[PDB]
């Protein structure tokens, strides 16, 4: 966790990518929350098994259940990027976060199927502003979750 | 129920004004805000150590930290669906199921109202407005009947 | 009047509203040069704007033209302002009534108020590039529509 | 003008104070709006014969044209507060806003009567983050356009 939180939170380039790209996903944080979701579950089918209680998530917005979800998942996201400047922060927080994964036995390697839907989404928000690096600085901050669980 | 209290709160203007209002204060420091309603809850109701036993020692606390930075990003959400009732209610019932499985009751969570009014009072000062304390348990309501 | 009509359809259209909102995200990353590039364009394609903006003075100078750079970022917190009224017809339409004024008295009408949305598609291919839909365009003419009734 | 700017932007005291107060205010941009509006309207009647446009402004919200003036306002101060890391942006920014106002034959002087409106605002809408020097931090900023007009 250590390392991962150094990596994200030592890196100006990591830090300023995830600031401007949450930038333009906080213009529709409902939007944001049902297309990465969306993504996932196109993406990841396999995915689908830790969401039952959800039923239909074909439905998208439709399914308040699959709504409320979408919608919560994104303030998770907020409470993150504002933590970036500070590592005991980040730290703390997401652990927080992992507690509940690690009881629905969400592995790091299972909770690392969020990486290239995640890209696809940021792809469809950023327009000319999506680059390699953004994604990867998605990538190095779901790899602090992944540590943690 | 949970409907029909959603309905009255996303109806009532001025209730609205008072929730974003305190809010805007209120969140102006998230984490010491945070900490201040945690730890007038631990205060006031003891019983609450015990749910949250998993914190450990909460009389320098990561795990509390974490958790009450966390709680606020909660509260923001249910702020930010206060004009559309079907999010309000969709957030709420989300919100609800953790709650739910750690048999939390309705008036357990209520417990909450009390540290709330405290917590507004040392961050409004002189500007602090009891109509504002009842706005807030007014939401507060709308979360108990989905427990 | 139209504004009211044409106010109610633009509220009730959620994947409309959505598409504003995606792209407003991307346009005002960079307000002021985006704002600068939407005038550009303009100056482009209704080059008798010019005359309209005639105070600017020398509008080829871009961001080395202070009052150009004025306005094209002012200009950009109109649009931040129609797309918060989005979700609200009353809010809407009362903001929208409000811009009309200054525009109603400089004498420029529907039609030349439409010369915009040309402007709006050739800043929104520059900004969103492989990820550019006409459905955008679309978007903003209908916001646009709003106005140009009021006029 | 300049001497105004530099004022404004030489102190990260105030650009600070302007910031934070601001983000307070965003929190509900239309009842801040409002909320301005009313007070100048209590605090100085005399502004009154400048908005005969408006109709009867102690309407507040019911009033359309007041409700639209007042949303508005705050576009500017978005704007205001939005640009102050670049003098020459402030500046290019008041001059334009200055053109409207000088047309209506609005003084310096006159304009200045938002100044205790804007106090009485933010002691209103501020709780216990309020002081003075957030206060004088909105006089010296509301001074930059006084002096461009
Ligand atoms: C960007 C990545 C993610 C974020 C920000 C996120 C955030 C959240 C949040 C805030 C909650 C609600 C609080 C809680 O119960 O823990 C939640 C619930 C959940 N998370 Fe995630 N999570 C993410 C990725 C994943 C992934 C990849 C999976 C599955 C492989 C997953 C499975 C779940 C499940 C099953 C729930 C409970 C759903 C329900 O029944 O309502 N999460 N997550
Ligand atoms: C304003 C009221 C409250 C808010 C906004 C709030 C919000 C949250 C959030 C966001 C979480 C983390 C996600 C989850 O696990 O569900 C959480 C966890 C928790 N909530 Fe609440 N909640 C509140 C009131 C209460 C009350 C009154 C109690 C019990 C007396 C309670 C008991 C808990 C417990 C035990 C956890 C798990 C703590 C841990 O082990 O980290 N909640 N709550
Ligand atoms: C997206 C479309 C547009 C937006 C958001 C916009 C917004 C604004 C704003 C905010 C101002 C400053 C306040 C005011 O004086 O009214 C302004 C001024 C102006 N508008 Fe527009 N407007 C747009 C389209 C047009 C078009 C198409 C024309 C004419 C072809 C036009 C002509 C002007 C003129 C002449 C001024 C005064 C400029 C100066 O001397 O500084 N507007 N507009
Ligand atoms: C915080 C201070 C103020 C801000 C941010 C502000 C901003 C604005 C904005 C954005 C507009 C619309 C664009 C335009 O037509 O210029 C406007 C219009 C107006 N301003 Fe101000 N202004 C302020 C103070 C004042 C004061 C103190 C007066 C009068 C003494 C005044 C008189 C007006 C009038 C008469 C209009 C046109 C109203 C209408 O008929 O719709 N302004 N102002």
């Not at chain 1, 998208?60 to 922060?89: C, E, Q, W």
């Not at chain 2, 209120?26 to 006031?44: H, I, P, Q, R, Y």
């Amino acid at each position: 966790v250590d390392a991962a939180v150094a990596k994200v939170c030592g890196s100006e380039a990591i830090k300023a990518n995830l600031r401007r790209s949450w930038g333009v996903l906080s213009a529709d944080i409902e939007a944001t929350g049902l297309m990465l979701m969306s993504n996932l579950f196109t993406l990841r089918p396999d995915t689908k098994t830790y969401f039952t209680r959800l039923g239909d998530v074909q439905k998208g917005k439709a399914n308040s259940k699959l709504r409320g979800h979408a919608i919560t998942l994104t303030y998770a996201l907020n409470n993150f990027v504002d933590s970036l400047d500070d590592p005991s922060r980040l730290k703390c927080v997401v652990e927080k976060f992992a507690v509940n994964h690690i009881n629905r036995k969400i592995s790091g390697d299972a909770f690392g199927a969020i990486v290239e839907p995640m890209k696809e989404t940021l792809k469809a928000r950023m327009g000319n502003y999506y680059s390699d690096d953004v994604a990867g600085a998605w990538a190095a901050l779901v790899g602090v979750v992944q540590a943690a669980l | 129920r949970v409907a029909e209290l959603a309905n009255a709160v996303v109806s009532n203007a001025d209730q609205k004004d008072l929730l974003r209002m305190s809010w805007g204060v209120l969140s102006v420091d998230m984490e010491g805000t945070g900490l201040m309603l945690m730890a007038n809850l631990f205060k006031t109701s003891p019983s609450a150590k015990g749910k949250f036993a998993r914190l450990g020692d909460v009389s320098d606390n990561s795990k509390l930290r974490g958790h009450s930075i966390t709680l606020m990003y909660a509260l923001q959400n249910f702020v930010d669906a206060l004009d559309d009732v079907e999010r309000l209610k969709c957030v709420v019932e989300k919100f609800a199921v953790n709650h739910i499985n750690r048999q939390i009751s309705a008036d357990e969570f209520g417990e909450i109202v009390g540290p709330l009014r405290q917590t507004l009072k040392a961050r409004m000062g002189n500007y602090f407005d009891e109509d504002t304390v009842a706005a807030w348990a007014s939401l507060v309501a709308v979360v108990q009947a989905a427990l």
